[PDB]
UniProtKB/Swiss-Prot annotation, chain A:
It comes from Rotavirus A (strain RVA/Monkey/United States/RRV/1975/G3P5B[3]). The chain holds residues 680 to 728 of 776 of the full protein. It is found in: Virion. Forms the spike 'foot' and 'body' and acts as a membrane permeabilization protein that mediates release of viral particles from endosomal compartments into the cytoplasm. During entry, the part of VP5* that protrudes from the virus folds back on itself and reorganizes from a local dimer to a trimer. This reorganization may be linked to membrane penetration by exposing VP5* hydrophobic region. In integrin-dependent strains, VP5* targets the integrin heterodimer ITGA2/ITGB1 for cell attachment. Homotrimer. The trimer is coiled-coil stabilized by its C-terminus, however, its N-terminus, known as antigen domain or 'body', seems to be flexible allowing it to self-associate either as a dimer or a trimer. Interacts with host ITGA2 (via ITAG2 I-domain); this interaction occurs when ITGA2 is part of the integrin heterodimer ITGA2/ITGB1. Interacts with host integrin heterodimer ITGA4/ITGB1 and ITGA4/ITGB7. Interacts with host HSPA8/HSP70. This is Outer capsid protein VP5*.
Curated annotation (Swiss-Prot), chains B, C, D, E:
The keyword Ubl conjugation applies. It holds the Pfam family Rota_Capsid_VP6. It comes from Rotavirus A (strain RVA/Monkey/United States/RRV/1975/G3P5B[3]). The keyword Lipid biosynthesis does not apply. The VP6 trimer contains a zinc ion located at the center of the molecule. The zinc ion is not essential for either trimerization or transcription activity of the DLP. Zinc-depleted VP6 has an increased sensitivity to proteases. It comes from the Viruses. Zn(2+) binds at residue 153. It is found in: Virion. Intermediate capsid protein that self assembles to form an icosahedral capsid with a T=13 symmetry, which consists of 230 trimers of VP6, with channels at each of its five-fold vertices. This capsid constitutes the middle concentric layer of the viral mature particle. The innermost VP2 capsid and the intermediate VP6 capsid remain intact following cell entry to protect the dsRNA from degradation and to prevent unfavorable antiviral responses in the host cell during all the replication cycle of the virus. Ca(2+) binds at residues 266, 286. This is Intermediate capsid protein VP6.
Amino acid sequence: EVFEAGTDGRFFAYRVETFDEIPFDVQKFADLVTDSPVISAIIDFKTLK
Amino acid sequence: MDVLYSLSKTLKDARDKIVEGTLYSNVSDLIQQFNQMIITMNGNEFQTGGIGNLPIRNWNFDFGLLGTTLLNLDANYVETARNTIDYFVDFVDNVCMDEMVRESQRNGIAPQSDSLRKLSGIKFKRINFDNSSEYIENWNLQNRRQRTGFTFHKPNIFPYSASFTLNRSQPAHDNLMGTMWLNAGSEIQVAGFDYSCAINAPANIQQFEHIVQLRRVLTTATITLLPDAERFSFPRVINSADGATTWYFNPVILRPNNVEVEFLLNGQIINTYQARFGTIIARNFDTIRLSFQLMRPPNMTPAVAALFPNAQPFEHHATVGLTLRIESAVCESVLADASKTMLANVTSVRQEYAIPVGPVFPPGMNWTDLITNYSPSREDNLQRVFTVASIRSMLV
Amino acid sequence: MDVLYSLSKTLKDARDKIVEGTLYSNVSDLIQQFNQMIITMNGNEFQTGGIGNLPIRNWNFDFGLLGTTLLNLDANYVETARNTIDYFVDFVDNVCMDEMVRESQRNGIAPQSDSLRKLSGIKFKRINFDNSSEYIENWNLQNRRQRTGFTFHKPNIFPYSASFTLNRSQPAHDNLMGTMWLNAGSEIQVAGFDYSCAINAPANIQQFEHIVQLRRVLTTATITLLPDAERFSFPRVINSADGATTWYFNPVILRPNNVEVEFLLNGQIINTYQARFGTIIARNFDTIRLSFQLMRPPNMTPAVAALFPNAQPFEHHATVGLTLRIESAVCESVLADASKTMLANVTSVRQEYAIPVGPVFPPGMNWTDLITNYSPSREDNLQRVFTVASIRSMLV
Amino acid sequence: MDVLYSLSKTLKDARDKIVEGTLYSNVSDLIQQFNQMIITMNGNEFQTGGIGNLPIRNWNFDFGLLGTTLLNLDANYVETARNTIDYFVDFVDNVCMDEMVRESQRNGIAPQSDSLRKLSGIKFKRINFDNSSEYIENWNLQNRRQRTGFTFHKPNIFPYSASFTLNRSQPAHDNLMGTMWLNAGSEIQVAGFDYSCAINAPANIQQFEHIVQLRRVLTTATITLLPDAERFSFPRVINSADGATTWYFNPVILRPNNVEVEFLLNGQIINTYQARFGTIIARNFDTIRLSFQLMRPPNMTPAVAALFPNAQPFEHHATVGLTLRIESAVCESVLADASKTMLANVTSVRQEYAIPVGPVFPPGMNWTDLITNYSPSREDNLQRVFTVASIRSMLV
Amino acid sequence: MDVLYSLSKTLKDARDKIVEGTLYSNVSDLIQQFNQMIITMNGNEFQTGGIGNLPIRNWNFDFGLLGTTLLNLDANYVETARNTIDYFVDFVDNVCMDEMVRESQRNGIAPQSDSLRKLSGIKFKRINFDNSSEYIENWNLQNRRQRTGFTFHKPNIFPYSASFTLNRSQPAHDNLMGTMWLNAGSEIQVAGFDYSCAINAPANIQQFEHIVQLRRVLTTATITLLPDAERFSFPRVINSADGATTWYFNPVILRPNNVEVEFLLNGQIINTYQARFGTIIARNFDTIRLSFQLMRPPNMTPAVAALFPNAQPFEHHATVGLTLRIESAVCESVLADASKTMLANVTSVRQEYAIPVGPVFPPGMNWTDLITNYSPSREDNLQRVFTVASIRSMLV
Amino acid sequence: SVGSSASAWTDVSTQITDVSSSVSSISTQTSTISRRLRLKEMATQTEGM
Ligand SMILES: [Cl-]
Ligand SMILES: [Cl-]
Ligand SMILES: [Zn+2]
Ligand SMILES: [Zn+2]
Ligand SMILES: [Zn+2]
Ligand SMILES: [Zn+2]
Ligand SMILES: [Zn+2]
Ligand SMILES: [Zn+2]
């Protein structure tokens, strides 16, 4: 499962196998992003879908 | 769903009625239904769990029938029936938990767990019998597309929102005019405040309006309307609209003037109540329009006249209010309320087994988020899980 | 208890179903059960005792069976059945009253009246039939040591206590810091006040904490949490902790900061809610920890800054609040709630007949004292009397 | 549990009684029970262990029976029985281990493992025979909800607690007055100290009190009371309340005065002992209240007078003490004790196989946390695992 | 007694062995014994008396025989047996309680209650069967005037006595020499103190002696002997012999020298242990003689030499201790101990029903008074009540 | 904290806030977090380019 945030204020949660948006779970994106590797969204969700 | 409910109802009846010493004439039909359940479920393999921390469990049904002849039930009959009922109740509880923790964007009304999908086959229709509960009755009626009605005591229809609107404001926040409200559960408190007390308003009357859009149509609603909003009637340091600073509120409560409560459906006035406080009835509505006026008292005693000077500073700020409580209502769609425990049951089951956030419901089944965006798919999934929760509550 | 409930249920069914014109097929099983009750009770002498002002009453049963000849019940059949049912209802009501007015320290769950003790003999087991009520279901589950459950709307779980704690105080009560709370029924209102508005706090934050220990574990609880505490948001004159003097409280309500509501079971955090208001679910808990903070506004408009000076005197005292209402919950032990009338029934029966204070319950049947020291003996006796009260209310 | 206990008891009796040369009349009934066990277990597949490091083991039973007509058992008969006994002992040991490593918040008393849940089927009830152990007897009585209790030697009823309370103190900790206690297992040592030796106390008497609340009601308890607390009888350097600094304690032991030990149940004085040392009996209690006094010796020899001056500095601090040891007791709930090995067995099994911490027991099966928060759910699960541990220790 | 024990044993065996599903071969002898008991007790009237607050209770026995002809016991069988067993167990418990609260100066070994006197008739001897318990076995041995043996863990053989003896003293109490001891339960702590540290002794050796005369002969006793007596190793303020004044004790512990523990029987040395610590065996004794010595260290470092000046004042007082714990032993007479609950049970039954003090036992069944004056009449009555208590504890 | 536990990466700050457009709280939280995920980019705590 992919969580995504943007400085513009756009956030997206989705699944890797199929790119369908998911209810964004704040307080889980934060715990993931404080420690785990963070990936720049060159090909951000909208382009991926 | 009807088959699962029938299993649960048969087990509940078996627990309640198959007791030591009772006449067999009291349970003859119940024993026949129980035997039909045994026959239908025999030779079937079921699997439950596998989502979150919900454990995988396999169920195989091979039970004999109850066919002993008696006048009054004895300990042997009760013990055998108890063993069978215990196994079946465990199976039904696990199936209900499995179905409660699942959702789908498409066809969320349809069964999600493979156990319930298997139970939805034609071969199991024999298990089906009396469907008398409110939730199963509504389920069957909606399957037939007849009108369905869920009766709620204090429906949880308004998502939590403590907000304010400033119709007149300035950086110092010393001469403000606006409204502040709390919409929570079945309660709507609104307070219109004017710092100048309508000294320069046309006819010394200020007008405040609060429009609340219900996410679902409520019918046969009993409402209690009270003049004052006690929540917005004490001194308060409130944040700025953008949080840049904080302003001061020092209410002095004047009675609301020219109160009109309009209960609207599709923008059409269904019910209107003018200067009526106490118990009122809104027969069918989806919007509430509370319009009330702050009227500067034409005649003031010296103590009152001291509070409202002609010009600034305004140390005391005039405030009118309104409190609206929906004591009871009827809604075609399911909702949380103060008397039922279905939302609590589903949330507890999802939290206990660490169910991952799905594609329909918000994280943690936050009711405010759910009712704010109460979409048709969310409504279907919520109805499904609430029906399953009631079925489970019949036993567990 | 099961036999007494069965008697009451049979009589209720007879009253409801034995009506003029009804088909005998609608009452065949009911008539058979009623006649079994007649046979079992016939030839037995009962006495309901004279504890308190309850009259000593003697009961003899020599009733003939109900007829089975009419295709449709008529007026004569209904009148004869009415006479028999009236006698049996009087007997059952008197037995229930005699049981409700009695308590034991050693075995409170066992019958205390000689009538119910006699009904616990084996020969009366024939009377036993459908046990479908919630209270009797829970009684039977408890007898078997199974997971019991009582669903309460607004459970009366918090004993009444309006108290305050002053973390910082002085003889003149002009620079105070502390909390004041009301824990009443299903409601907890708490308010932390700082007279200095955290001017000298380590980071302009003052931390307030309220710990409420529930006397019994609550499960599947729907809880409404709201920011402000309307009860501690107006000026008050409050007796000192020792009653030697009085102090002045002049609240100005600030938004609570960093609100953490924790629902704990055995000291472990079962549920946690951060800055979440509205409807929340506490799935299983026995303690509530409400942590909030009074944060000095970093930016203030001129009036707000005027409220809070850098040093004494402090005429406006900053206050943050919290309100927590348990709309509904589930508890393994019996409790008083806003819906069921069991506590009222037991108290009314005791007061009507001037029952002397026993060794178990408080000397008024007062719920605050009872729920305060909710001992296992008190719980057993309360379950017994509440079950008997439900049985009686089925008829009376 | 009864079926598992019956398996273990049958295997133990097979080991003990099926011996070379024994008359067949000595084992006829035992051989019948053993053959019944073989018959019932034959054709059944069992699976044990998928939690932690407990390996998955699969059990199949296709064993032959034992002869029934010979006069004296010989080496051939014993050799035939030994292989079956070994396999069944291994199976029962693994089933007991699988059950000991499991817990549930909802139904802790019900079986948790798949194997024990299958053994709860009706067909295995034929294996059931004599349930004569204390733990199984209590299991059955408690299932029937009959008054039953466990007898403990040195019950482990007090969670570890080494603490002190200072009624009189100051930053230099030079003139203190208070109490220090150790609560550990069945032992309470309490010591009240006065640095001034009650020079300024009214009547030259200083009163100390210690209240200990037991988490479960102990009955028929034998207590040893001694007038000195040897734990707090030597010089100590003690951390302050907040750990900011350390203070000095230099006890000089005076005999306690007006010693009163009150054993209370729900706030009611059940037993009272004044100036009684040695063996005392506390028939029924949940609270211990120790009240003692320090009295200045009205007459002092020159050294004693030198110990206690009229004013500071106080170099010798007068201490009175009490020691209370519960030699044996009876409790309706299971507890760890110095004689049984149930807690040790459960802890060892959980540690050896790295059982993940569950939602009921404290991690590592810590007894202090377990008895500090000894909830009904914890009590249920602890009784279950302790009974299983006794069953296992019957063989292993 | 044997008939009462047989009733209790039969009922315990019935509760343990008559379980649902068990083979009838497991209970054939038990069912025969139970039917024999039913036949013997049927038609007999019993009355448990009203001594103290113990209620008067009337018992009538009219029960049918337990069935034969079942291959495996079913639920109906167990239910009928449970009803009969419950009535019989209640009767047995009440009879045991009635017997436990009664005593006589002469013929105290004979039954005192009317129920047990009736049960001692010849017509009830049929009920008698296996007498395997230790207490009933010793009862039978005593009835036959054979050697009796009770095994105790930590026998309560020493009455509480904390005393001191001053072999050298004076009004100032600055240069004392003597011994102080505590004898409690199975523990003896003794400490010989010399304030001069044997500076003027004949060979710098001070000899200390302690003789403890046991009031009953103990055989096969294992005893832990340890050098120091921690109870008398810290500073104390001790009342004078007559309480006129108080003296100061400031021990400095030197190791005991030339330790000598003699266990004497009728003034004859049975066991001797010299310089032996740890576990020792006293095979048969009634007196303990502990002879130890304080030897002045011939060589002393400056710190040691500073504590022991040639002449007064003596601020540091030399002490040599000894601890003796009887971990287990065997006695021909009944005693209180840590493991068993006989004394606690008898005392609890006497306290619960407010039995007035009789002419035999000390008030409150105080063990110190009981064993300080353990007369033959007291021994007979105590054995009787303890045997009845064990019989009751088999079922309660 | 907008996470389970406190972290400098997961702290909310000034955010004068923009009433110009109807803004969700989650959007503000995610934007504030991403503005520090930029320093994650420049702290070798990223995975892809
Ligand atoms: Cl309400
Ligand atoms: Cl010990
Ligand atoms: Zn503003
Ligand atoms: Zn309500
Ligand atoms: Zn005060
Ligand atoms: Zn021991
Ligand atoms: Zn301190
Ligand atoms: Zn003296």
